[PDB]
Amino acid sequence: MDKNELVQKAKLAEQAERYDDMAACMKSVTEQGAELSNEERNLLSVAYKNVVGARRSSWRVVSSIEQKEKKQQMAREYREKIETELRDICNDVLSLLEKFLIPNAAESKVFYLKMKGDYYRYLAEVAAGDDKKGIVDQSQQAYQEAFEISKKEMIRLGLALNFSVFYYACSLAKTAFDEAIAELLIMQLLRDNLTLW
Amino acid sequence: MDKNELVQKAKLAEQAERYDDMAACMKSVTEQGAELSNEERNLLSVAYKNVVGARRSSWRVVSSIEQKEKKQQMAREYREKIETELRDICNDVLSLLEKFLIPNAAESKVFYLKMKGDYYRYLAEVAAGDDKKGIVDQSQQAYQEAFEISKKEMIRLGLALNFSVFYYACSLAKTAFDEAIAELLIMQLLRDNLTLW
């Protein structure tokens, strides 16, 4: 396939901004013989996040507008479409993780398992019925799994942020952020998130 | 088809940033029975402009990257693609233009004819052999048509700007602005462009 050409292809794509292209080359690379060289590993997260997050954004706004009837049938209609593009990415990557990444790793374990909880979390926001539950739980047992592989050889602090804000707590953000002070964007971020909650 | 629902749809799309969704919605409105109400007329040019605009940016970076060999086929190959994606937009807007828009026009006549010149100018940047010439002149005589209505019920000054970059001139861009300073963003823009040439 030429893994290192798919890699040097995604890079080009990122420099050219086309993220759906980048996430594509990086998915091809990931489903080869894994172990994603540090550049590749980030390239994966950077491409997929530019993609997913975009829909996460669209979905946010079109939903704000769906709430504030027919202008809502037409808004539910669109939101249903932007939720699909979204679900398709989270599934696309979720598989990559559980199926090739998380089971092929030390630090990278919590980097990935954080990402598993992350995308599942995006699926939870967007979920529906009991579906909602089965998913939001899966977000926890992944975040909490990376969390447990934190007090180890330590991404870690970054997890705190996500996982903490997954609960919505502020408590957990201090703790993380408190153990970070005795180590003396990431640090201020959850300090900042405490101004909120 | 519900022209106004297609219209309400593109105001939504753009608000959600999905510009391809916008151009799509606005293209439908324009290929109805025209005389695109002013709100529609810019909405159309804001959608299509972010779209082809995106491609021109990508084309610029990828083309530069492509010059600085196998990594070059890899990039000539990628450029090849962005170009195809970009030629389908110009062809796409040029038809609305010449076959629905420009013939169903006061001041709009210059706005549109300018747009014709623009999108032909884009194909001129991207074209290759003897194709290049046919395109660049087709752009000239469109710019040149709108250019002569410049001197009518007058966009016109913004036309001067574009039409001036079309020659690369520094002449017309002074002239455009000379007279603009006997009328006392756009105005600084062509002055500023004289600080480059």
CATH architecture of chain A: Up-down Bundle
N→C terminal distance of chain A: 48 Å
Helicity of chain A, in percent? over 70%
Q: Give the SSE string of chain A.
A: HHHHHHHHH
Largest sheet of chain A: none
Q: So what's the CATH class of chain A?
A: Mainly Alpha
- Can you say what the CATH homologous superfamily of chain A is? 14-3-3 domain
Would you give the CATH topology of chain A?
Delta-Endotoxin, domain 1
Computed CA radius of gyration of chain A, to the nearest angstrom? 18 Å
GO cellular component, one term (chains A, B): hippocampal mossy fiber to CA3 synapse
Protein name (chains A, B): 14-3-3 protein zeta/delta
Modified residues (N6-acetyllysine) (chains A, B): 3, 68
Family (chains A, B): Belongs to the 14-3-3 family.
Characterise the protein shown here.
2 copies of one chain form a homodimer. Chain A is about 80% helix and about 0% strand. Chain A has helices at about 5-15, 20-30, 40-65, 70-100, 105-125, 130-150, 155-165, 170-180, 185-195. The N and C termini of chain A lie far apart (about 50 Å). Chain A has one domain (about 1-195): 14-3-3 domain (Delta-Endotoxin, domain 1, Up-down Bundle), CATH 1.20.190. The interface between A and B is medium-sized, with 20 and 20 residues.
What are the key terms here?
homodimer, 0% strand, mainly alpha, 197 residues, protein sequestering activity (chains A, B), Delta-Endotoxin, domain 1, 14-3-3_CS (chains A, B)
